[PDB]
């Protein structure tokens, strides 16, 4: 919207107090920009856990997708934000959501070398046999990157 634009900006800027103010004054929790990015995408992106929680409490869609196929879990997994991965999963994030290239959060987390995030994704039923559109599983990726520790838990 308008109140929605303010909210997208405050979320991305990591201004927690502004977000709370906007939310209690009735801002649209599921506002999005032209890319389909929601405030929850943005707070997960920058790793602001308290904001992620506030937004979930006020009815944020945990599975909102941008036009590139990114959910907030994709962005949190890619950027290495473990507690945010945990909370998104607990409150219903689709662990096997595919972006445009067929990448699941497990692929993104494996590509960036984020071991603890991979362990949590697996705990929540991440598919080790899912292929992206270059035909690569997360396991194949970890081998390409020479990462013993990921290869061992992804086999």
């Amino acid at each position: 919207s308008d109140l929605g634009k303010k909210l997208l900006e405050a979320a991305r800027a990591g201004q927690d107090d502004e977000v709370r103010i906007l939310m209690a004054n009735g801002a649209d929790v599921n506002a999005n920009d032209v890319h389909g990015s929601t405030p929850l995408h943005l707070a997960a992106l920058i790793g602001h856990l308290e904001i992620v929680e506030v937004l979930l409490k006020y009815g944020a869609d945990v599975n909102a997708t941008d036009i590139w196929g990114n959910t907030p879990l994709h962005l949190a997994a890619r950027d290495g934000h473990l507690e945010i991965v945990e909370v998104l999963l607990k409150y219903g994030a689709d662990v096997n959501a595919d972006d445009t290239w067929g990448s699941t959060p497990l692929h993104l987390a494996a590509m960036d070398g984020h071991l603890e995030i991979v362990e949590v994704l697996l705990k929540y039923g991440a598919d080790v046999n899912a292929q992206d559109k270059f035909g690569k599983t997360a396991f194949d990726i970890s081998i390409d990157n020479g990462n013993e520790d990921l290869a061992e838990i992804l086999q």
Binding site: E9, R12, A13, D33, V34, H35, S37, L42, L45, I46, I67, W68, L75, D79, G80, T100, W101, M111, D112, G113
Partner: protein, 228 residues
């Protein structure tokens, strides 16, 4: 892990300005663009307008010409982000683009900060375009493919180079290749880290604004680095 002086400037959302002065087979035109980029997300949001009237070439032919400093780089690769690390004083970007069975563009651009805004100023020259053909004849579809590009250090020239092919879709199912030869050099004169070779992956969506009378293009992009 590393955060260079120039990387510090891209932690937030950054306003963008693009100015292009063009000449193709003698047809003069100008394009201006505005919007913003978010290098942490890896996204661009831009709107471009032809200020001279009607664009004498297809908009898709201009996309590569109209700021790779907005690519998202993983933490382990931040020391390889030449583009952001050249800021604020910026870099020169030079291309020759050969359209197969048709003419070519030559571009020179300066990308740098002017105040708080990242500004791409371009000169473009096109020649030897068939009046019949896909470009001047405007037979390109209004869309854009996803492309990976391989970024290479060039020690001898103290910069980087990129040689890539763009596939433009034509009305009747066929495809028009555009071979890009790119060279980038810092404007600063100090010592500079040249990157290890790696890739940029670009996705692009072209659209129109419902309320814009002028010849324009809305361009959204999503860009990530990989391969180290």
């Amino acid at each position: 892990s590393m955060v260079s002086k120039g990387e510090e400037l891209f932690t937030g959302v950054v306003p963008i300005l693009v100015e292009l002065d063009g000449d193709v087979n003698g047809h003069k035109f100008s394009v201006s663009g505005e919007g913003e980029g978010d290098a942490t997300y890896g996204k661009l949001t831009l709107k471009f307008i032809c200020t001279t009237g009607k664009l004498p070439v297809p908009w898709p032919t201009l996309v590569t010409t109209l700021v790779q400093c907005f690519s998202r780089y993983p933490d382990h690769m931040k020391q390889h982000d030449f583009f952001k690390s050249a800021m604020p004083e910026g870099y020169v970007q030079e291309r020759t683009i050969f359209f197969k069975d048709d003419g070519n563009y030559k571009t020179r651009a300066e990308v740098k900060f002017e105040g708080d805004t990242l500004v791409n100023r371009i000169e473009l020259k096109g020649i030897d375009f068939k009046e019949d053909g896909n470009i001047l004849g405007h037979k390109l579809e209004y869309n854009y493919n996803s492309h990976n590009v391989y970024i290479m250090a060039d020690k001898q020239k103290n910069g980087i180079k990129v040689n890539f092919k763009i596939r433009h879709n034509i009305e009747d199912g066929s495809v028009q290749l555009a071979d890009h030869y790119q060279q980038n050099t810092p404007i600063g004169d100090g010592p500079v880290l040249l990157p290890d070779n790696h890739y940029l992956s670009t996705q692009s969506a072209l659209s129109k604004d419902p309320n814009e009378k002028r010849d324009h293009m809305v361009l959204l992009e999503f860009v990530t680095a990989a391969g180290i």
